Amino acid sequence: LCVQWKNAYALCWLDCILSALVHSEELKNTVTGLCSKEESIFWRLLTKYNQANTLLYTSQLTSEIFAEIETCLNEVRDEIFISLQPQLRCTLGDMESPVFAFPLLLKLETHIEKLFLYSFSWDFECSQCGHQYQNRHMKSLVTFTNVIPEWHPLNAAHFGPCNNCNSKSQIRKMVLEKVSPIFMLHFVEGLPQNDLQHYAFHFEGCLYQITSVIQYRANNHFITWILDADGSWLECDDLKGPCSERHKKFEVPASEIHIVIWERKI
């Protein structure tokens, strides 16, 4: 009962983003409250997805319905691809990275980008030579590698080298300052473990919980996992037809957890 995009050439890097977007509650509520809705590529995305999804419910005329679903979904995927193509310089057959494409897609519309932009500082001190810094940034997708075993959004540290003396395995830490309604991170080697409830956090009184994950399966295929209302999970694997697959638990190996999406909750 959850329609999804079918594979087209190398586009799973885009498919995983589109599935994350159309299942986001905060994105939906913002899009419906936009001035000049029809002018928004995100309005068009959510509207066309909803029409395809409604068609799929209608399905349970078969050949006509599935033709309409494909044309509907392919049209809005192609519109978004063409919007990104000048910046990624990509063809449909080129393998790309959602880590590169997601921030560029958000930047297309400031009212949507604002949902994702958080402020933080990178803090670093070298135990060997004293080199230290605190650098403030505002971003929509930060990348982590070599995280500490006990990594947590409220203790978001990783190992890295000193640029002054080249000592290895110093500590660099993301210190959150202001968190957006949607908060996303990229993990090069996944998370230390895959029990996602552990990574929920409060910040300035608001609860953030993980609502979707992009899996990097077998280092060659992106698949989006969506948390449903009753606690089950939807796997959107574009190689598996028009409908998504329901799972009771969340089954991504920890090392394949690529992009993690938290959302602010009541």
Next chain:
Amino acid sequence: HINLKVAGQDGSVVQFKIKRHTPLSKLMKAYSERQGLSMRQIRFRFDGQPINETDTPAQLEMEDEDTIDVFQQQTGAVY
């Protein structure tokens, strides 16, 4: 002739000098050698956009002391 920083995801920053119209290939190769990384295994980005070995700082409008981001390649989807 300008200075370019290459910033990795572990927080490393290495600085290099290069001429405005020289292809970024010689810089991407030098960085691979310094860090022990395979060239086929990394991807570079400037101003949020992926860059090629054939691009020059002149084409990309790189000013001196600009930063290039570098990532372990994690692309898809195979078909």
